[PDB]
């Protein structure tokens, strides 16, 4: 974890998937699947409804994971006017503004992208 994520309180999780309305007992394939929940708003989703790979799912369960809308840049801690184009790491799902990457990026990377923390 990052220092600013450590001991930063997490919201009460809602035990329903906001995408399919199932619980941990029933995803869209009518099979059990544990939810993941946003640390800031508490809303939840099945990893299969979020379209997360098994490997990404394992990693975000060990991190202070944020949903798409709550996601803040792991460098500058902001969302801001360029929020819609924040990159999401394909290893840890953290967000980074292109201009906050190391090195700063002028154009969107192509294909799978791994952030400066994971690379």
């Amino acid at each position: 974890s990052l220092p600013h994520e450590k001991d930063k309180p997490v919201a009460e999780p809602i035990p329903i998937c906001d995408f399919c309305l199932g619980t941990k007992e029933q995803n869209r394939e009518k099979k059990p699947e544990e939810l993941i929940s946003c640390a800031d708003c508490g809303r939840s989703g099945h990893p299969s409804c979020l379209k997360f790979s098994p490997e990404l799912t394992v990693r975000v369960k060990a991190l202070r994971w944020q949903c798409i809308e709550c996601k803040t840049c792991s460098s500058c801690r902001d969302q801001g006017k360029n929020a819609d184009n924040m990159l999401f790491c394909d290893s840890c799902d953290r967000g980074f503004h292109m201009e906050c990457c190391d090195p700063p990026l002028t154009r969107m990377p192509k294909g799978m992208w791994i952030c400066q923390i994971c690379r």
Binding site: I16, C49, L50, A83, G95, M108
Partner: peptide, 22 residues
């Protein structure tokens, strides 16, 4: 790479508000 925009399209968006959990 994925962005906020592309991730939104991937989920298809939340279920309708009145059907969501309170």
């Amino acid at each position: 790479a994925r962005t906020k925009q592309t991730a939104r399209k991937s989920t298809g968006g939340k279920a309708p508000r009145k059907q969501l959990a309170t």
